[PDB]
Amino acid sequence: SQVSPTRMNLLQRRGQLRLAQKGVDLLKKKRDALVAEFFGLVREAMEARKALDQAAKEAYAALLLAQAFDGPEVVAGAALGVPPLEGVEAEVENVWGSKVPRLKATFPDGALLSPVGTPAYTLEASRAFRRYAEALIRVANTETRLKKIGEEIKKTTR
């Protein structure tokens, strides 16, 4: 078709392998590291998920006795008591494609703060929220980590 001259390039096109060939020589086991240890956070991902996932209903249905038919009401007075909405602590990090941010919502609130006095189930039931919020956190930076590792893994190896 039509590519390049003939002489003189010999030496330049030669430095190609060194550049390509070498750049990628190690670049392979390069990303391999973050993915290897990366799992350490993934396994744990379900650590809390499964753990508090089953204890989630624990209180929810637990107070379905004297609070079940009376929840709507118990909820009025202490519903979204201290629902900050992003009071959460967001973190920035670096991964192929740019730098994606993570974060965890850690703040004293679901920590037995909605008052209205109430019966017995409430306080035990409100405590349950903990396994959503608190737990739902394990995944925001770990469950998001996985996708992050997806791009790299793929783009890199591609």
Partner: protein, 100 residues
């Protein structure tokens, strides 16, 4: 943070912490999904896997490829979490990392 999923199970949400407000028959939930994002001024709103939680395409078909609060799939009714657990692991990881 204002997220929803199921009415019957959401109730607690509105109780402490956040305020969840979804339907268990609103399989579509799209009605809300979008509206919710109209503002999207919370962290990352998620929902049960009984609605649109498998197809994240919902959030992306609406956000338009922008970085908006992401989705997190569950189930509402639990039973065995030793099934689609080792699976979600496989679901992210295979189409990349771990093939076989």
């Amino acid at each position: 943070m204002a997220v929803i999923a199921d009415p019957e199970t959401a109730q607690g949400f509105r109780l402490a912490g956040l305020e969840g407000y979804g339907a268990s028959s609103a399989e579509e939930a799209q009605s809300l999904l979008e509206t919710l994002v109209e503002r999207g001024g919370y962290a990352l709103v998620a929902v049960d896997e009984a609605l649109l939680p498998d197809p994240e395409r919902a959030v992306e078909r609406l956000m338009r490829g922008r970085d908006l609060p992401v989705l997190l799939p569950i189930a509402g009714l639990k039973e065995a979490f030793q099934g689609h657990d080792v699976e979600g692991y496989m679901r992210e990881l295979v189409r990349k990392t771990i093939g076989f």
